[PDB]
Amino acid sequence: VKRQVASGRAYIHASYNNTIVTITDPDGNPITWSSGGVIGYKGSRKGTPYAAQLAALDAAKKAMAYGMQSVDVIVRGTGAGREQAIRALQASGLQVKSIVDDTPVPHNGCRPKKKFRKAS
Amino acid sequence: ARRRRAEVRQLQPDLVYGDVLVTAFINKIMRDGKKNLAARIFYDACKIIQEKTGQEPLKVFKQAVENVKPRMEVRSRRVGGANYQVPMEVSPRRQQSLALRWLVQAANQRPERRAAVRIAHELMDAAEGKGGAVKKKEDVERMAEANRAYAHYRW
Amino acid sequence: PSRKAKVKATLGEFDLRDYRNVEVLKRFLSETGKILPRRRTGLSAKEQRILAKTIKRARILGLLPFTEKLVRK
Amino acid sequence: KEYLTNERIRAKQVRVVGPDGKQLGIMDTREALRLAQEMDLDLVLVGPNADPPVARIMDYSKWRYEQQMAEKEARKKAKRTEVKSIKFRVKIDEHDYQTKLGHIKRFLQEGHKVKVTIMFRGREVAHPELGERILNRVTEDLKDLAVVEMKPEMLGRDMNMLLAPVKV
RNA sequence: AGGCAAGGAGGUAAAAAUGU
RNA sequence: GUGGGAGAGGGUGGUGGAAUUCCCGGAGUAGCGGUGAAAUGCGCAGAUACCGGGAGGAACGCCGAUGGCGAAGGCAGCCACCUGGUCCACCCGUGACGCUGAGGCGCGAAAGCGUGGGGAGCAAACCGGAUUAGAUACCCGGGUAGUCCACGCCCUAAACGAUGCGCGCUAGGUCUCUGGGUCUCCUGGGGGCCGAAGCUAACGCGUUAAGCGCGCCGCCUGGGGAGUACGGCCGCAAGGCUGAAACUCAAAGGAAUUGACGGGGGCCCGCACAAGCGGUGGAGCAUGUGGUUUAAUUCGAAGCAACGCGAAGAACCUUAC
Ligand SMILES: [Mg+2]
Ligand SMILES: [Mg+2]
Ligand SMILES: [Mg+2]
Ligand SMILES: [Mg+2]
Ligand SMILES: [Mg+2]
Ligand SMILES: [Mg+2]
Ligand SMILES: [Mg+2]
Ligand SMILES: [Mg+2]
Ligand SMILES: [Mg+2]
Ligand SMILES: [Mg+2]
Ligand SMILES: [Mg+2]
Ligand SMILES: [Mg+2]
Ligand SMILES: [Mg+2]
Ligand SMILES: [Mg+2]
Ligand SMILES: [Mg+2]
Ligand SMILES: [Mg+2]
Ligand SMILES: [Mg+2]
Ligand SMILES: [Mg+2]
Ligand SMILES: [Mg+2]
Ligand SMILES: [Mg+2]
Ligand SMILES: [Mg+2]
Ligand SMILES: [Mg+2]
Ligand SMILES: [Mg+2]
Ligand SMILES: [Mg+2]
Ligand SMILES: [Mg+2]
Ligand SMILES: [Mg+2]
Ligand SMILES: [Mg+2]
């Protein structure tokens, strides 16, 4: 059973390990999501730019198979695939209404793991 | 190698057709600096081509070459987790050279007894779109796409 | 090295000790909900400090945003 | 490994298998698809090598997951225990030797097979008399925890034994 | 538009005991 | 004193968002996570990614500075309250009341400890996974004490400006913060940077002197022994302060200089690698060497730069055995 909308939101979560693109309704109910490992790419490639792009494309395709047309790109996390993913989405024929950043930066919140200190 | 761009040799053009590509192919064929022997081989191949798929053998050869010219090849580059096969675009002259090399390899990989014959057959195959050199090219292309991830490691 | 405008001279004469005045304070944030640095606003140090405090107060009351979704990109 | 699912299947007539093992026989592919939809599942071509291809109505993703789990289990049951190596030397003092022995013991306990090479370097002629003696001593020390898998085999600038756990 | 930089990123940087 | 500031000064009472994490609701599915690669790890009992709500701790992004405050240790959301220092202007008051300060009392990061809570993240130890010769380590996945608060103790530190405090003097330029002014320029008080004289082993310091002086305090008297013992004191403990000598070496050490080096940085280069062709390794033989043999298999050559080398001619000679 499908629901259909023609409009919505493309949440791109770009980590350095992987890029995961969830495509979801204009409110934010997950329609179809794609990832690095989703499109076969398991390992380092998972969060490579090309992989991210591929994932984005896949997600777009899936959305299109729900009649989805006009998306709202929301980018979270800086990673290799955030720009590439965006580009892919743009290419897909999916009407990207706005590309909007939403990086979840703590307002000097609680302590990172040792790796993400040193730079403190 | 370090100092300059090191120019391409302007090969003294051919005699039978007047083509530099032809000369290049002859050179590729030739081992042990025996040009006449190889030139003769090439002309035999041409003759064979004329006989068989009854067309202008130079043109056929050119077509074959075109068929095997790659656009993408995987250069080996190390970026941490040992070496990575990294896909990049191939420059025109270089690409041509590569194609020629592949063609020659295919010719001297083929079953039949005599080289000239083999070369002719290889050329024909290339023109068609099938066989050794073309297969090699296809493989290389695949390698480029099956590693397209690493593309961003443009040299 | 960025030579366009400065939010000191851009704005008219105003009170940056006034935090009810917010259409005058949204002048000093980024496209993000971020207090613009000295080289952006072009105020004196003391003045800048005062402005920052005012902005913070506004945010607490809920008149200037604390953080924003960055458009276009 | 993987199959054609619902729309991926282009062959016209297919043999329909159920969620548990419901034999529906050779039906149309379209019909099978419809059935799958009704079930809120998918028909997946489980035997493309069979009489009008054998295709199971299943949750394909679930099946895939199961397969993956099985694979993981297989590779976790492949025994993480391997070879630990402990290069000794000719002139190895007592404390250090004991430390090395302790290490070896620990490895054995963990479950590991132990490459107990003696490094040589200089003269490498009087080597077996002293090196071999040392090896023998080591073996004696580990009489209870280690059965000698091997016997001292000189290749390079060295001689290697392997050791195995006494009881598994 | 290119210039030159200012600043944010993102990729590289990560693997080394044997003598006479 | 009067007037006025600046401030992350200190305490106390509040409170505001981001984030994390968790719970619950939804929608959705095959991975996510992680890395130089991986692997454990969690995931269809539905994770991740997404929105809605709640719970909760903890920290306070941007401003932010090379800034400010404090005697240091230190101190950053914002608000309010209590309160400390401090600076300036006025020269109005007192009239030497000053400076230092052995002891003493007070403060004193972090870790630690004790009792009571709290516990989100993180995270010693610890358990996993890798890496590796090994790995008690870096790298990852978890995870306790701890970190947070309350009260009590501990007192150390690279508690460093490695610069005790005060006051006077002795070029300037400069950026800065923060006052006062008849204010594109003066004058105070901080914080930096470059420099006169001077100093300094040099490095450097240089009106914030490491300069010239003066006052008072601390301390040093070669290195290691050793911040150790022993005593004493303090602490619930860990441990702190105090603090040797026997012995032992001819030094230990500072600053810089020339090199060499670097798994520092830049600029280069070479068949260096790469692009390419051909071989070596594999055969057999030719040769030279190691080794071993032998009466002797003369003697030399040793990574590159020894090994078809001295030998551009060992049957005898050569030949040295
Ligand atoms: Mg007053
Ligand atoms: Mg849920
Ligand atoms: Mg007076
Ligand atoms: Mg009087
Ligand atoms: Mg005292
Ligand atoms: Mg503490
Ligand atoms: Mg953790
Ligand atoms: Mg371990
Ligand atoms: Mg291990
Ligand atoms: Mg850890
Ligand atoms: Mg405690
Ligand atoms: Mg303390
Ligand atoms: Mg310091
Ligand atoms: Mg300090
Ligand atoms: Mg000191
Ligand atoms: Mg004092
Ligand atoms: Mg101060
Ligand atoms: Mg000054
Ligand atoms: Mg001078
Ligand atoms: Mg100076
Ligand atoms: Mg000055
Ligand atoms: Mg001095
Ligand atoms: Mg001590
Ligand atoms: Mg005592
Ligand atoms: Mg020195
Ligand atoms: Mg090469
Ligand atoms: Mg040589």
Numbering used by the authors:
A (entry chain K): 10 to 129
B (entry chain G): 2 to 156
C (entry chain R): 16 to 88
D (entry chain X): 3 to 170
Kindly provide excerpts from the paper associated with this entry.
In bacterial translational initiation, three initiation factors (IFs 1–3) enable the selection of initiator tRNA and the start codon in the P site of the 30S ribosomal subunit. IF1 is a small protein that binds in the 30S A site. IF3 is a two-domain protein that plays a particularly important role in the fidelity of selection of tRNAfMet and correct start codon. Here, we present 11 structures of Thermus thermophilus 30S PIC at resolutions as high as 3.6 Å, representing distinct steps during initiation.
PICs 1A–1C contain IF1, IF3, and mRNA (but lack tRNA) and differ only in the conformation of the 30S head. The 30S head is observed with the same canonical swivel seen in 70S ribosomes (Selmer et al., 2006) or eukaryotic initiation complexes (Hussain et al., 2014, Llácer et al., 2015) in most complexes, namely, PICs 1A, 2C, 3, and 4 and PICs I and III. In tRNA-free structures (PICs 1A–1C), the dumbbell-shaped density is seen for nearly all of IF3. The NTD binds near the 30S platform with a possible interaction with uS11; the bulk of the NTD is positioned away from 16S rRNA. The CTD density is observed at the top of h44 adjacent to the P site making interactions with both h44 (1494–1497), h24, and with G1517 of h45. The CTD in these complexes is positioned such that it would clash with the tRNA in reported structures of the 30S PIC (Simonetti et al., 2008, Julián et al., 2011). This P-site location of the CTD (henceforth termed as position 1) features several highly conserved interactions with IF1 as well as with mRNA in the P site. CTD at position 1 also occludes the binding site for H69 of large ribosomal subunit and hence would prevent premature subunit association. In tRNA-free PICs 1A–1C, we observe an unusual mRNA conformation, in which a base at −1 position of mRNA stacks with G926 in the E site, while the next base, the A+1 of the AUG codon, stacks with A790 in the P site. The A+1 is flipped toward the 30S body and makes an H-bond with Arg91 of CTD. Regardless of whether the mRNA purine is A+1 or G+3, these CTD-mRNA interactions suggest a role for IF3 in identifying and stabilizing a good candidate start codon in the P site, even before tRNA binding.
